[PDB]
Amino acid sequence: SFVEMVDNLRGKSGQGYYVEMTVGSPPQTLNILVDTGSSNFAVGAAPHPFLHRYYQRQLSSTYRDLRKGVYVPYTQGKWEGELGTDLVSIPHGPNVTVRANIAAITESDKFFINGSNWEGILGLAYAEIARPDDSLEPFFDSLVKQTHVPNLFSLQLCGASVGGSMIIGGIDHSLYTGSLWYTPIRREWYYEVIIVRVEINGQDLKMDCKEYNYDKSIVDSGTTNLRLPKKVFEAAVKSIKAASSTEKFPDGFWLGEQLVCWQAGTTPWNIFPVISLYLMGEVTNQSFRITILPQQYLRPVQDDCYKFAISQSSTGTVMGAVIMEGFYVVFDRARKRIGFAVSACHVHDEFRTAAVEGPFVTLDMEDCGYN
């Protein structure tokens, strides 16, 4: 039955991944953003120039008003709405129907995207970061409590218009190769993890380990980029510039503002370095590494044109879609860990390969967590 959930994700580049859901009685079909960076389930419930359709509470016989307002601010965009509950199902997910908390979006600012094919968002993180507070039970918590669906889900995000898979309730072993490597979920709010080492083309950045998790490090499918804290970002860019010095770039490009183009099929992948992120492992003094290629952090946008998808953050490391793409990522809530493996959809490069490798020995990993 996991075969039914394979390829249930769609999306546009830089605009997130969505899954089809239905809410209310009779079922109203909506495309819902899959976001591990938040914990609120919300849908457009009023007309908007960017919305093809929206949740119509008056047409649902099972809708219940909670008579409470709610607003959620994201790093990009924000909305406010009215809380309520209704029946929810996932056509290409588990064959169950649950009553869940739903935020009916009545007002928003730069949240919905022009010509987007999604009209809502599914926050898959924990209750501690839910708005208005942690008493508003997130959807996946409701799903697990009301059904027998195991407390686990997997995301397979595939690059280029994009596609992928959200496996609800388990692991689909046909969707990845090699072994799964697990890092602990440090605390249950965001999906927080700990980065213990960073290498660019085999060379250690040699920064204090805390800098990598300054504030925090989270896994966020709702974010496009790999986002790095200021000090780490600057060190990374300086290194990537040095490796690709054979060409000079507009510099708007390194800030993600300007595109860069080459004649079709002539992109010089070889001049851009591979990046290895070492994550805390499951046993003492043990870590593992995930390696990403330039094909991942150079997002495609008639030449072949790209935008630099590594950007700066003031709120810690964000491992976004560029990082997740090419990998099978298991959000094992039951065992408080996140697993990584090479995806069945991986970008092919003739000379280099994205990888998940271990074990490695890394001493004093606890000192890497920010406090």
Ligand SMILES: CCCN(c1cc2cc(c1)C(=O)N[C@H](CN[C@@H](C(=O)/N=C/C(C)C)[C@H](C)O)Cc1cccc(c1)CCCC2)S(C)(=O)=O
């Ligand atoms: C421009 C800001 C940074 N970047 C970025 C880009 C894009 C989105 C996001 C963030 C982004 O912030 N996404 C959120 C979830 N992640 C954040 C969050 O805010 N969590 C909420 C707190 C718990 C209260 C995380 C903590 O930063 C969901 C969401 C919301 C509107 C649209 C989309 C997804 C679809 C894709 C659009 C591109 S980027 C360019 O990739 O570096």
